[PDB]
Amino acid sequence: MLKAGVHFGHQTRYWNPKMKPFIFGARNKVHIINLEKTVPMFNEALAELNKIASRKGKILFVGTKRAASEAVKDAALSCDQFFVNHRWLGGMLTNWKTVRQSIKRLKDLETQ
RNA sequence: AUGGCUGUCGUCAGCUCGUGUUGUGAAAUGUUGGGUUAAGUCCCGCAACGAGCGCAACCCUUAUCCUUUGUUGCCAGCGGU
Ligand SMILES: [Mg+2]
Ligand SMILES: [Mg+2]
Ligand SMILES: [Mg+2]
Ligand SMILES: [Mg+2]
Ligand SMILES: [Mg+2]
Ligand SMILES: [Mg+2]
Ligand SMILES: [Mg+2]
């Protein structure tokens, strides 16, 4: 059910057509999500993340946009995870070898 | 045919690479954009992240002062010359 009750989408003239099945749509020419559809999907996502947690992996929050920057760099980092809060450097994962060097430099300066 | 050495554009600020990404491909990005500088100088932004040769600095000389030493260099204070 509406365990949330705070999700209403963007204007209608900016909608991606392949989001049709998830759109309820109505007032003020602004799309509104179908919460009755999100809840099963959100629950399944949480279940899958929990299984990943059981395997003890990394989940790497990504919240670069200037609306949840602190919301990502908060107790969201409390338990076993990592996060990207500001600009996502291009290739942070595709070439981890080169970014690895910057991390080593950062660690050296922290101890320095 | 060449080594070595030299002039020149020009002491101009440019020239490149690894990995990543884009393109079927030649290639592109980075190196572009907003400011700024003598400078690809620096900051911010950014599918780029780093690095190298260049710029700058390290070199010599000149402009001020201090310590040291005082002859063949010097003469402010003392003696008569
Ligand atoms: Mg390709
Ligand atoms: Mg160039
Ligand atoms: Mg280019
Ligand atoms: Mg510029
Ligand atoms: Mg430079
Ligand atoms: Mg740039
Ligand atoms: Mg006399």
Automatic annotation (TrEMBL):
Superkingdom per UniProt: Bacteria
Sequence similarity: Belongs to the universal ribosomal protein uS2 family.
Protein name: Small ribosomal subunit protein uS2
Taxonomic lineage from the root: Bacteria, Pseudomonadati, Pseudomonadota, Gammaproteobacteria, Enterobacterales
